[PDB]
Amino acid sequence: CTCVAIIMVSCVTSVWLLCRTRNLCITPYKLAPNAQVPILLALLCCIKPTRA
Amino acid sequence: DKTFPIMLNGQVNGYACVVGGRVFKPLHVEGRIDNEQLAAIKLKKASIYDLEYGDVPQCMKSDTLQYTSDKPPGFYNWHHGAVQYENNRFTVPRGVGGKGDSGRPILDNKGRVVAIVLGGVNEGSRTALSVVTWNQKGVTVKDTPEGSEPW
Amino acid sequence: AQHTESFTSAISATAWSWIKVLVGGTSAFIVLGLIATAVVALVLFFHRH
C-alpha cells in the first residue's frame, strides 16, 4: 500500500507539471494565428501540431 | 468561359468545369451532362480531392488555362461577385451561396482558373467557401472551413 | 514403444525453416502494406499546410 501511494502521489505530479508545460507550449501560439510554429515543437517537444 | 450544367429531371443541381488536361465534376452531385461529346466520358469516383476522368479528345482541348502557385491576395473573378484573399476565401456577402451551383470556377484577371467551389451554403453573417487550391509547387489541396455543408 | 511421441516429434530442421519462411515473410508483407497507408496519410497531411 506504500508502493501504490508513492506511485499515485508521483503520478499526480506528472499532470500537474507536464500539462503545466504543455499549456506554456501552446499559449504563445494560439495568441499568434498568423505565425507558423517551429517543426521541433510541433510534434516532438509539444504534442499539438499545426491545424489548417 | 465554358462550364456545363448537370441535368437531373430537368433541373440544375451542379456545374461541371473543364480545365486543359482533365474535366471536373463534383462528387456530391449527380445527373446527366448536357453535351453529346461529353456523353462518352468514363465517370469514376475518387477521394475528396474531386478527381474526374478527362478523356475528352483534342477537339475542344485548351479551354481554361491553369493558374500556377504563388497566387497574390488580390482580385479574383467569381461568377456572382469577387473574391480578394489567398490563404482562405474572402467573406462573400449574403444572398449568394444557394444550392445546386457546385463546381463553379473562380477565374483570374487573365481568364485562368485557380479554384473550384465545393460547399458552404451558409455560415452566418458571412459565407466561407470550401475550394481546392495548389499550395506551393502545384500539389492540389482541398481546404475546408469549420462545419461547411456541401453545396 | 519405450518412449512417448509428442506433438513436435516429427518436424525436422528443414521443415521448420519452411514454417518460418511461410509465416515470417507473409506477415511482414502486410506490415509493409500497413506502413504504406501511414506514410501517404502523413504526406497528404503535410500538403494541407
Side-chain angles (χ1 to χ4, degrees):
Chain A
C1 289
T2 319
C3 260
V4 309
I6 292 328
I7 284 294
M8 257 316 259
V9 86
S10 274
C11 213
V12 296
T13 63
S14 92
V15 292
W16 194 87
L17 274 176
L18 191 127
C19 293
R20 170 70 53 153
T21 324
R22 205 212 171 246
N23 279 32
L24 263 71
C25 263
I26 198 185
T27 50
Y29 287 116
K30 337 162 60 158
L31 263 158
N34 282 15
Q36 286 164 133
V37 301
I39 211 79
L40 168 87
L41 317 176
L43 278 164
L44 254 287
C45 309
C46 323
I47 287 187
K48 205 177 289 260
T50 318
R51 296 208 186 274
Chain B
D1 43 354
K2 189 220 208 183
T3 44
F4 293 61
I6 318 162
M7 291 305 78
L8 185 62
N9 313 137
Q11 73 240 20
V12 188
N13 45 313
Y15 255 53
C17 161
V18 49
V19 196
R22 261 191 161 140
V23 312
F24 284 87
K25 182 240 201 188
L27 304 107
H28 30 266
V29 310
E30 80 266 22
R32 210 193 42 115
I33 212 68
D34 252 346
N35 203 1
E36 220 284 292
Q37 214 153 329
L38 288 191
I41 296 294
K42 277 302 188 82
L43 195 128
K44 66 115 203 168
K45 78 198 164 187
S47 167
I48 41 185
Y49 270 23
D50 198 31
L51 158 57
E52 301 326 290
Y53 192 29
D55 55 280
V56 64
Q58 193 264 288
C59 283
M60 69 209 50
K61 267 317 210 199
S62 316
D63 180 62
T64 50
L65 185 50
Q66 43 189 1
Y67 194 74
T68 63
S69 282
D70 204 25
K71 330 163 253 168
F75 313 117
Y76 291 110
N77 180 55
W78 170 237
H79 177 245
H80 294 303
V83 178
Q84 199 168 346
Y85 206 27
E86 168 208 359
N87 273 288
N88 38 307
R89 280 312 108 166
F90 169 69
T91 80
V92 293
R94 305 270 301 276
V96 80
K99 219 187 180 300
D101 49 320
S102 63
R104 286 243 174 89
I106 316 143
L107 267 308
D108 216 347
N109 45 3
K110 318 301 291 174
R112 315 165 115 190
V113 73
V114 80
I116 293 282
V117 296
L118 287 157
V121 175
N122 170 46
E123 328 292 313
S125 150
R126 320 295 299 133
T127 298
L129 275 35
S130 34
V131 312
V132 283
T133 39
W134 304 355
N135 234 38
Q136 207 38 69
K137 303 149 201 87
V139 202
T140 82
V141 196
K142 181 222 192 58
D143 203 290
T144 40
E146 273 72 26
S148 96
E149 162 144 29
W151 151 57
Chain C
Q2 293 268 8
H3 46 245
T4 50
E5 155 138 12
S6 188
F7 157 72
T8 167
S9 301
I11 311 164
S12 67
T14 314
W16 221 308
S17 293
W18 282 97
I19 274 148
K20 296 199 298 268
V21 157
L22 259 67
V23 160
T26 72
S27 180
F29 215 72
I30 324 175
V31 178
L32 173 78
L34 266 196
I35 213 178
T37 81
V39 156
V40 287
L42 193 100
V43 170
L44 291 199
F45 178 73
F46 273 44
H47 292 335
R48 294 275 337 253
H49 31 271

